[PDB]
Design a binder for this molecule. Structure first.
Ligand SMILES: [Ca+2]
Ligand SMILES: [Ca+2]
Length: 141
């Protein structure tokens, strides 16, 4: 609950809104204290439980963070995985890690969100009648 201040949370939600003007992809952040040994499986469960599969193009992506460990997973839906190459999320991960290793938690998420919108834009361009399919709220567990 104290992971982020209200001002930091506002900056993150504003970064999602800006990223979603560059792509039809949908982005959410989920924060929790501790993860499971298989972090990918935990992020997949959270993605499901947040109903992030409810996008026309199956292009939702969850940035899952385990705050006590400062570890994270970028989990994209099937629409993304069917078209992108193996290095797709590298710039997003690097942008988050660069800031997390310096203790800049808010900035890591903002920078990752911005990078993710630009990466998704390559395969999922924003369209005039875009729908905001998933809430931009930070999910807390
Ligand atoms: Ca949208
Ligand atoms: Ca959204």
């Amino acid at each position: 609950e104290e992971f982020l201040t209200a001002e930091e949370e506002k900056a993150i939600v504003d970064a999602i809104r800006d990223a979603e003007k560059n792509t039809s992809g949908e982005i959410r952040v989920h924060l929790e204290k501790t993860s499971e040994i298989d972090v990918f499986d935990r992020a997949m469960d959270v993605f499901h439980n947040l109903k992030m599969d409810n996008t026309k193009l199956q292009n939702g992506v969850l940035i899952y963070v385990a705050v006590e460990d400062k570890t994270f997973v970028i989990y994209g839906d099937k629409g993304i995985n069917d078209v992108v190459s193996d290095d797709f999320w590298d710039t997003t991960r690097n942008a988050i890690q660069l800031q997390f290793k310096q203790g800049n938690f808010k900035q890591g998420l903002v920078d990752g969100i911005e990078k993710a919108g630009m990466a998704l834009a390559k395969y999922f361009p924003w369209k005039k009648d875009d729908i905001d399919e998933l809430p931009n709220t930070i999910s807390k567990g």
